[PDB]
Paper text:
The precursor PdDfsB is cleaved by subtilisin to yield biologically active Slf, and the chemical gradients of both proteins between two growing colonies could be accurately modelled. However, remarkably, the dfsB gene is widely distributed across Gram-positive and to some extent Gram-negative bacterial kingdoms (PFAM entry DUF1706). PdDfsB adopts a four-helical bundle core structure that belongs to the DinB structural superfamily. The most strongly conserved region of PdDfsB is the C-terminal helix, which is present within the mature Slf sequence.
The third, well-populated clade contains exclusively Gram-positive bacteria such as Listeria and some Streptococcus species. During purification of the two Streptococcus DfsB homologues (Streptococcus agalactiae and Streptococcus pneumoniae), both monomers and stable dimers could be identified. We attempted to crystallise both forms independently and only the dimers yielded diffraction-quality crystals. We solved the crystal structure of a S. agalactiae DfsB dimer (SaDfsB) by molecular replacement using a pruned CdDfsB structure as the search model. Interestingly, the source of dimerisation is via the C-terminal helix, which flips out of one monomer and inserts into the other in a mutual fashion.
Residue numbers in the entry:
A (entry chain B), B (entry chain A): 13 to 150, 153 to 184
The structure:
């Protein structure tokens, strides 16, 4: 286990989200669709990606609550249709303002906060407790493994060591 | 794909690593094994975890590239044994000083950046390009899926939008 309890997970979600969404404060609406060569996504596409995926994970849990046997990311799109799914995210939130996208993403992140609260320690942290989690596990590229063993723990274990320093180095 | 290209991946690896490893600069060696109730790991255990996993990913790649069989995660502990694996990491590496751990992890992160530089875009970002990557996916809990759809992209797409602003709002 890498998060110790649901409180720690919730705090990391909240704090990473705040750092992320704060960056869009200074972006003019007229530039929401501005694409540069150095970065693949526009500000609008950047936010739309988060709105799309956070909507889906909430849907999975909802559908599973209903007894639905959920193996697909969505209505329509395969686990091999992700490039097309991201495309779908972009048009669904196309011509939405940064302000509007931010409002919706805020709502989703809170819903996720509530989902964590409403989940016992067990269904959050033990295997085979949601069939959508099992199913979604059913192909990973090299770059995902690199991220999962560098960027991801370098973030979460940095939070851990800072908490250790708070208590130990006083 | 979430990362624009391999340089964007390498940048997030190096940036997140620098943030992480900087936290250990003011931890006295004498307190490296000090355990407290509020965090699950000591500073040496925290480092040892990273040393263990970064060593493994480098080993899987090296071994596969010379035509050897690769047993993931190890040839002794398989995937139902990650608690045992982490505990092996700690016996192997946590006895080392913070300075020694930091030297090894520095070297591993350097090697991972070099590995990324040396890989084609296809090998990094397409499925079924490494046997070790396919082998590693053949059970994830709910909390992992929550992290992967909030904390992880909130970090990665924050790096995107910060880069975007540096070019677009100069």
């Amino acid at each position: 286990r890498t998060y110790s309890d649901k409180n720690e997970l919730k705090e990391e979600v909240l704090k990473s989200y705040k750092k992320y969404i704060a960056e869009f404060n200074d972006i003019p609406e007229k530039l929401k669709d501005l694409r540069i060569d150095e970065v693949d996504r526009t500000p609008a596409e950047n936010l739309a990606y988060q709105v799309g995926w956070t909507t889906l994970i909430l849907k999975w849990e909802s559908d599973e609550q209903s007894g639905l046997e959920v193996k697909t990311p969505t209505e329509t799109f395969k686990w091999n249709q992700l490039g097309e799914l991201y495309q779908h995210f972009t048009e669904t939130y196309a011509s939405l303002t940064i302000k509007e996208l931010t409002a919706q993403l805020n709502d989703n992140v809170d819903a996720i906060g509530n989902m964590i609260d409403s989940m016992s320690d067990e269904v959050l942290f033990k295997p085979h407790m949601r069939n959508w989690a099992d199913s979604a596990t059913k192909v990973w590229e090299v770059y995902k493994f690199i991220h999962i063993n560098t960027v991801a723990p370098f973030g979460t274990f940095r939070t851990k060591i800072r908490k250790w320093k708070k208590v130990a180095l006083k």
